[PDB]
Design a protein around this ligand. Structure first.
Ligand SMILES: CCCCCCCCCCC[C@H](O)CC(=O)SCCNC(=O)CCNC(=O)[C@H](O)C(C)(C)COP(=O)(O)O
Ligand code: SF4
Ligand code: SF4
Ligand code: SF4
Ligand code: SF4
Ligand code: FES
Ligand SMILES: [K+]
Ligand SMILES: [Zn+2]
Lengths: 119, 115, 96, 699, 129, 87, 209, 48
């Protein structure tokens, strides 16, 4: 279903600008403390993260982060086939999560359009 | 109130009596533990470990604390006798993997900030 | 744009790259360093500035409930542009 | 016995007349909601959040401004009181921006918390919100002014506490805006305090921006060492990193304020840090080495010289533990040349009597004063919170202030007597008109800055000022418990060093230059390699590479004041201890532990292996050094005054000029604030203008 | 007062041998007993009412893999709450923790008068409102 | 070699046991300083402290006599002996 | 009911439970220290630790009580009390379709009486309380650890026990077995200070000191 | 997608990639933040 909670992703506006403005609400609400965030003013003055890690082996895939997010920046995507041969590839980076967003945005956005009126 | 109720012992001599009984039981159990768990240590080593575990609490003067220590020691003895503990549990009294921590001021100063 | 370090390591959008003496570069050997090549700062820099004819403009990020919390931006400074503090879109009054 | 009886929800309390409704509720443990009200500011009564029902009274009253009447029953939880609060919160949130995720106030706001606790949970505002343009008031306070709720706290603070009338409101009605009208910097030593008093994210810290959320920070309570006030602070840390500095309330020292150097110079704690031991290679250059190697080098140099051949200089940021450890170590080689960079007159009593070298009236005591005399000092920049207390007493107690020195701006009007030190002799002999003012005064106070003791005639200046203080105490014009004589110190390590028997100033080392020189955080540049024989073996121990580190033969990386539990004695004499917020970086170590390790390697092991043991040693040397938060009285001013009359030194004709005449001289004073880029931005903004330092505050 | 066979005991309660705490984290720790300061960012006083027990902060380093904050201190997050200072010191003493306790700092009463803002001859008069 | 480097006088402002040393400092300390201008005589008063005299000699060797309930004449004798050998 | 959000209050059950609490306090004055009914109609009996067996047996066997089921037996740690441990008995009466809570107290060194003779269900609950809080139960048929690892030191549910404890476990290839070491965390737990500086509930305000 | 194609974005991958675990294209984590503490660099000029 469109509500399915799989692999996480960081999303952008149509302009290509990131949605995350580093409020840290997802990190505050994360039941497993799987989200690690560091932020600072960007060179253009924007409020943006410099660290955004999700320990996917700490994660319980509850979807509380995407509920807390006020800008639909962090989501749980539809992907569920991302098993790894080592423990280290499951400790996600900001680059990893942004590449997940760019990889899956086409269907992530369709799922969100399907379910956002219930949210 | 001014006074308190005992666990078992109404005095320090009673606490000592039970401590001696527990020490006796542990001392006799050690060879059977060494044989049964197939430990790579000697019976002298195990009995010295039992003594050193007893000697950690030699400073205790409260008969109720002594009674609870005896209760926990008997619990540990029953885990050892009934083979509820594994070999790894028996061998955890001997911190064979942990490196020798520093004790003097200079080495502790060299390796970090901890007092 | 995504540049290169003097060691040849790729520099991320947060400006991270190990120095030439950092042993931690051994983690990328026989592997790759994962870098997102879409720098959001350069992307939002490419967007035009809207010439709206009002002192106060409102921006919710586009898509209504799918954008960001709706905010109001003052456009009285004639040297600066009023930009949204959520999505970076810029606004300015017509031709001053 | 003139207390009246009022009721707070039926419970009776006895209050002094003039107590407001808010205070009467405060003494039963009930905190009335408020935005504009601050207990340390004047009453404004504009936010209307404190409205409360008086039983039998049809109209609600502003609890913050309304004095209680006899027999009044305050209904703090009646439906009328709740509806007043809900309406006021609705009006406050009508035009408030939806900035909580992007606003640094989120999680510790007040608007958020009182919306949750006292306002409704939903909106019925169906219109477009207000938006005002941002104001730039310097590189320290980011003003996102469309978040402002017009509580006037910043304006009241700036006008009363800081003494600068730059903040204000322009326009009226819904488009009334808080600012400076013109484009003008809000430069003041106390400027950063309008961030904390601001209930919302309208005024925020630029250095702290976007960097942390309130809930994730760990709060370590410690003491400021950027001056000798000893302001109580909270150090916010997160994941092993110092995040910001906040004021911590102490009614007797700093109230709830800190100076801008205290607030923002923590930027320097991340730059130019000494992290590893260093020695000189065969090419003469400093290179990293192990602790054992460097310590063995120093110990080899230690046990080859003795007496006057080994000396030590203590810098301005050094704890008492390190001071006593270094003194013990140097005494082991029979060395008594343990000096400080800051000179205090050693003639007469010198350091023997503790009352000779501290603020005897205490920081809280200037409120009780009738008249204060300031000599050769700029308390505004030397000790900003002491000057804030002086202005507080100038404002409420109608304190009269006179000054000898440069006509420096002090944020309050005072009477300028002159700048030549000859006036002190003029007052002491009773010829000057101000001598009568001091004589006809119940609680006079004479404050001599430690900055004026750095002169070559500082001994004569101290003698003349003591002659002034004694001349008004030999007549029955002041009680015995009141202390008139005070020394205002500007160096955080100075009073502890004097207490422990350090020699004030580095004249002993100039008299007998050492072959071994311990530079214990000494970055003043008083002693350079040209004042030392040819091959002096200079040790530097500290946390920053600023001045002393370049010239040293060995470098011992020490801990900064946020990285150790350390005793610091303030200008009035009370010992206070910091606590570690983070550990020292790299291989840096606690300073007394470095000295103890060096002593053991040298074969002269100091008799303490622990912080409690070094603190008991401190107790053995001077027992007041472990009486934390207690100000111990020091007596025998008359002994010091009759000892001071034998030195018969003269006064120079040189005018008394403070080292800091304007704000640009305030920011950059020690090694931490010289490594601070925020202090550099402050200096740049002060010296050039508002367009010099630029930063896009666009989110 | 009751039939419990009241046995005489010393008034130095010591439960350190029963807590299971490793010996390093008893003698070498130093707890702080204090009422937390009011967060100067807010004007709410509801967090300055109870006494706190916090341990001395130890070393936090950076994780080589992710740059996370690592620790080897089991008591880095342990924070106990107490109603009075006496309860906190009794708890610290029976647990064998060396402690320093500081006196609670409360705001001193202050004389607030709105009518002072318009004084006829005092400096308390405000130039703006 | 083991000459006297400094003396520390610890006392209390109000405690009756430090009253003799308080009197000594009031009436005799200035003469002691005029006779010993280069000797550090560090007088440190602290509340509820038992009166104590410290004498630091060469190479960090210190010894403390106790001055509790001393008369000013006794503190004068105790300082005379410390400052002149006998002790 | 024009209040669709507020939980409805049932005063009949409140009165019934109040009357039964008065009844229980009157029948056993020797052990009942306090009885109270919550705003959500839950009745608690506060007793001296000596009265555990008498009060529990009365509630089980009295024809007007018939609390035949021991729903739960747990402990609560409150360090600021000299008797830090609060022992909680939750009992259910099928005959009267009612529930009751019985609470007493103890410290680290005073044994609570085992109630296995009253309820056979108490056998594992008392073992669990001993395991996680360290409370001794005198005359327990078999008192020992139930939840924690063999040889585990400490009582984890005490408020002063650290969340991750003191030891970790890993397999060591040199000694060819699982070993225990002092705990190190690659990422330490991040302590959050969440409490608001403003009072939420005035009705629960404690009087000032 | 033939009947309802996804919305075109310029940042969406134009080439889908499968699970590259166990390949030299696998993801390896690293810290994305810059160094916190700057050390003091000694002068290159000797004092003597
Ligand atoms: C197989 C390998 C090993 C595997 C197994 C390793 C562990 C085996 C033992 C496990 C139990 C552990 O010893 C703890 C307990 O039982 S503690 C009993 C109380 N302990 C006291 O100390 C009381 C107070 N003490 C004194 O009163 C005296 O000092 C003393 C009695 C010591 C000597 O009295 P004496 O008259 O001088
Ligand atoms: S899904 Fe849940 S556990 Fe996973 S990161 Fe989001 S909030 Fe944390
Ligand atoms: S992902 Fe969303 S909730 Fe998390 S910090 Fe960014 S904006 Fe806030
Ligand atoms: S000040 Fe900031 S956190 Fe507070 S209500 Fe306004 S936007 Fe939200
Ligand atoms: S800027 Fe802040 S302190 Fe000043 S009036 Fe506005 S809300 Fe109040
Ligand atoms: S608090 Fe009384 S009106 Fe603002
Ligand atoms: K603010
Ligand atoms: Zn926008």
């Amino acid at each position: 279903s469109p509500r399915f909670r799989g692999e996480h992703a960081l999303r952008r506006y149509p302009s290509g600008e990131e949605r995350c403005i580093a409020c840290k609400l997802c990190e505050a609400v994360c039941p497993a403390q799987a989200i690690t965030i560091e932020a600072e003013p960007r060179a253009d003055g924007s409020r943006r993260t410099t660290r955004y890690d999700i320990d996917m082996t700490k994660c319980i895939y509850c979807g509380f982060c995407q509920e807390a997010c006020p800008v639909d920046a962090i989501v749980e995507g539809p992907n569920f086939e991302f098993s790894t041969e080592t423990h280290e590839e499951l400790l996600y980076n900001k680059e990893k999560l942004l590449n997940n967003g760019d990889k899956w945005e086409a269907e992530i956005a369709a799922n969100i359009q399907a379910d956002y009126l219930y949210r | 109130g001014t006074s308190v109720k005992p666990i078992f012992s109404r005095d320090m001599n009673e606490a000592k009596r039970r401590v001696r009984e527990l020490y006796r039981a542990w001392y006799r159990e050690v060879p059977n533990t060494v044989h049964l768990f197939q430990l790579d240590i000697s019976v002298k080593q195990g009995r010295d470990k039992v003594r050193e575990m007893f000697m950690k609490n030699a400073h205790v003067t409260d008969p109720r604390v002594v009674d609870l220590l005896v209760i926990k020691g008997k619990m540990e003895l029953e885990e050892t006798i009934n083979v509820w503990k594994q070999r790894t549990h028996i061998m955890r009294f001997f911190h064979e993997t942990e490196a020798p921590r520093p004790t003097d001021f200079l080495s502790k100063f060299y390796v970090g900030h901890d007092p | 744009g995504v540049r290169t370090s003097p060691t040849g390591e790729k520099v991320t959008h947060t400006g991270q790259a190990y120095d030439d003496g950092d042993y931690r570069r051994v983690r990328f050997s026989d592997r790759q360093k994962e870098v997102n090549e879409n720098f959001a700062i350069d992307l939002i820099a490419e967007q035009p500035v809207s010439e709206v004819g009002s002192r106060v403009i409102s921006c919710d990020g586009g898509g209504g409930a799918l954008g960001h919390p709706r905010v109001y931006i003052n456009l009285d400074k004639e040297t600066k542009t009023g930009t949204c503090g959520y999505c970076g879109l810029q606004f300015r009054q017509p031709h001053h | 016995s003139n207390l009246i009886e009022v009721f707070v929800d039926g419970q009776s309390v006895m209050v002094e007349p003039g107590t407001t409704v808010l205070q009467a509720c405060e003494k039963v443990g009930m905190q009335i909601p408020r935005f504009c009200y601050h207990e340390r500011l004047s009453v404004a009564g504009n936010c209307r959040m404190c409205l409360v029902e008086i039983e039998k009274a049809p109209k609600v009253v502003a609890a913050c401004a309304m004095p209680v009447m006899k027999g009044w029953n305050i209904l703090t939880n009646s439906e009328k009181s709740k509806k007043a609060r809900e309406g006021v919160m609705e009006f406050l949130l009508a035009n408030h921006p939806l900035d909580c995720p992007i606003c640094d106030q989120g999680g510790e706001c007040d608007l958020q918390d009182q919306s949750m606790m006292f306002g409704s949970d939903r909106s019925r505002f169906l219109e477009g919100k207000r938006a005002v343009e941002d104001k730039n008031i310097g590189p320290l306070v980011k003003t996102i002014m469309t978040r402002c709720i017009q509580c006037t706290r910043c304006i009241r603070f700036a006008s009363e506490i800081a003494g600068v009338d730059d903040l204000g409101t322009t326009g009226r009605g819904n488009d009334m805006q808080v600012g400076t009208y013109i484009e003008k910097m809000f430069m003041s030593e106390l400027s950063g305090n309008i961030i904390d008093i601001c209930p919302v994210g309208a005024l925020t810290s630029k250095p702290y921006a976007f960097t942390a959320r309130p809930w994730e920070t760990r709060k370590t309570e410690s003491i400021d060492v950027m001056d000798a006030v000893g302001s109580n602070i909270v150090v916010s840390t997160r994941t092993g990193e110092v995040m910001r500095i906040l004021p911590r309330m102490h009614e007797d020292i700093n109230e709830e304020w800190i100076s801008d150097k205290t607030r923002f110079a923590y930027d320097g704690l991340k730059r130019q840090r000494l992290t590893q031991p260093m020695i000189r290679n065969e090419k003469g250059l400093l290179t990293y080495t192990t602790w054992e190697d460097a310590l063995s080098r120093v110990a080899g140099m230690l046990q080859s010289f003795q007496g006057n051949d080994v000396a030590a200089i203590a810098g301005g940021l050094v704890d008492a533990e390190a001071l006593v450890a270094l003194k013990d170590l140097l005494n082991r080689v029979d060395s008594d040349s343990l000096c400080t960079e800051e000179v205090f007159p050693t003639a007469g009593a010198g350091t023997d009597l503790r009352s000779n070298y501290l603020l005897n009236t205490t920081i809280a005591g200037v409120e009780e004063a009738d008249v204060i005399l300031l000599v050769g000092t700029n308390p505004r920049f030397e000790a900003p919170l002491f000057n804030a207390r002086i202005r507080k007493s100038w404002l409420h107690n109608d304190l009269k202030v006179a000054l000898i020195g440069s006509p420096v701006d002090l944020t309050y009007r005072y009477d300028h007597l002159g700048d030549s030190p000859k006036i002190l002799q003029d007052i002491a002999s009773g010829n000057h008109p101000f001598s009568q003012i001091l004589k006809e005064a119940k609680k006079p106070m004479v404050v001599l800055g430690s900055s004026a003791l750095q002169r070559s005639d500082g001994t004569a200046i101290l003698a003349a000022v003591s002659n002034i203080a004694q001349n008004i105490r030999l007549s029955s014009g002041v009680t015995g418990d009141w202390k008139v004589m005070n020394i205002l110190h500007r160096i955080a390590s100075q009073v502890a060093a004097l207490d422990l028997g350090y020699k004030p100033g580095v004249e002993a080392i100039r008299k007998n230059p050492p072959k071994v020189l311990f530079l214990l955080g000494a970055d003043g540049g008083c002693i350079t390699r040209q004042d030392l024989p040819k091959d002096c073996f200079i040790i530097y121990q500290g946390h920053h590479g600023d001045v002393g580190a370049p010239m040293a033969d060995v470098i011992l990386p020490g801990a900064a004041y946020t990285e150790k539990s350390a005793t610091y004695v303030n200008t009035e004499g009370r010992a206070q201890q910091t606590k570690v917020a983070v550990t020292p970086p790299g291989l840096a170590r606690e300073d007394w532990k470095i000295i103890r390790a060096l002593s053991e390697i040298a074969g002269m092991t100091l008799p303490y292996d622990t912080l409690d043991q070094v603190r008991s040693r401190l107790e053995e040397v001077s027992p007041n050094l472990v009486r934390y938060d207690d100000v111990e009285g020091a007596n025998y001013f008359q002994q010091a005054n009759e000892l001071s009359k034998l030195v018969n030194q003269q006064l120079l004709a040189d005018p008394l000029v403070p080292p800091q005449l304007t704000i640009k001289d305030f920011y950059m004073t020690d090694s931490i604030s010289r490594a601070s880029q925020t202090m550099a931005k402050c200096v740049k903004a002060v010296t050039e203008g508002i367009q010099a330092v630029e930063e896009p505050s666009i989110c | 007062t009751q039939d419990t066979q009241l046995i005489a005991v010393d008034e130095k309660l010591d439960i350190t041998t029963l807590t299971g705490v490793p010996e390093e984290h008893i003698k070498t720790r130093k707890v702080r007993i204090f009422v937390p300061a009011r967060n100067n960012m807010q004007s709410g006083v509801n967090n300055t009412k109870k006494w706190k027990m916090e341990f001395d902060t130890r070393e936090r380093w950076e994780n080589p893999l992710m740059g996370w904050s690592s620790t080897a201190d089991p008591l880095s997050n342990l924070v106990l709450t107490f109603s009075t200072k006496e309860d906190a010191v009794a708890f610290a003493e029976k647990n064998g923790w060396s402690f320093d306790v500081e006196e609670r700092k409360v705001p001193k009463p202050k004389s607030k008068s709105y009518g002072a803002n318009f004084s006829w001859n005092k400096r308390t008069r405000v130039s703006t409102k | 070699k083991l000459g006297l480097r400094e003396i520390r006088i610890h006392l209390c402002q109000r405690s009756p046991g430090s009253q003799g040393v308080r009197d000594f400092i009031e009436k005799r300390y200035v003469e002691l300083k005029k006779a010993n201008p280069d000797l550090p005589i560090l007088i440190r008063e602290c509340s509820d402290v038992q009166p104590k005299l410290w004498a630091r000699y060469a190479f960090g060797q210190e010894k403390n006599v106790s001055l509790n309930n001393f008369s000013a004449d006794q503190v004068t004798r105790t300082l005379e002996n410390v400052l002149s050998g006998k002790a | 009911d024009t209040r669709p959000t507020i939980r409805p209050r049932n005063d009949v059950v409140h009165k019934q439970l109040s009357a039964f609490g008065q009844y229980v306090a009157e029948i056993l004055p020797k052990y009942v220290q306090q009885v109270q009914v919550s705003c959500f109609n839950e009745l608690e009996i506060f007793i001296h630790p000596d009265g555990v067996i008498p009060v529990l047996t009365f509630l089980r066997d009295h024809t007007n009580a018939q609390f035949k089921s021991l729903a739960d037996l747990t402990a609560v740690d409150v360090p600021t009390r000299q008797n830090r441990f609060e022992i909680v008995y939750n009992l259910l009466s099928l005959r009267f379709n009612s529930r009751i809570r019985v609470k007493t107290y103890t410290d680290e060194l005073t044994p609570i009486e085992s109630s296995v003779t009253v309820y056979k269900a108490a056998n594992w609950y008392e073992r669990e309380i001993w395991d996680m809080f360290g409370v001794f139960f005198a005359n327990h048929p078999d008192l020992r650890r139930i939840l924690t690892d063999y040889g585990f030191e400490g009582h984890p549910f005490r408020k002063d026990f650290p969340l991750s404890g003191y030891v970790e476990l890993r397999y060591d290839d040199e000694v060819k077995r699982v070993v225990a070491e002092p705990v190190e965390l690659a990422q330490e737990f991040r302590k959050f200070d969440l409490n608001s500086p403003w009072e939420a509930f005035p009705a629960y305000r404690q009087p000032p000191e | 997608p033939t009947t309802k194609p996804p919305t075109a974005r310029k940042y969406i991958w134009t080439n889908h990639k499968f699970n590259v675990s166990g390949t030299p294209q696998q993801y390896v984590p690293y810290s994305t933040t810059r160094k916190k503490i700057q050390e003091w660099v000694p002068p290159s000029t000797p004092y003597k």
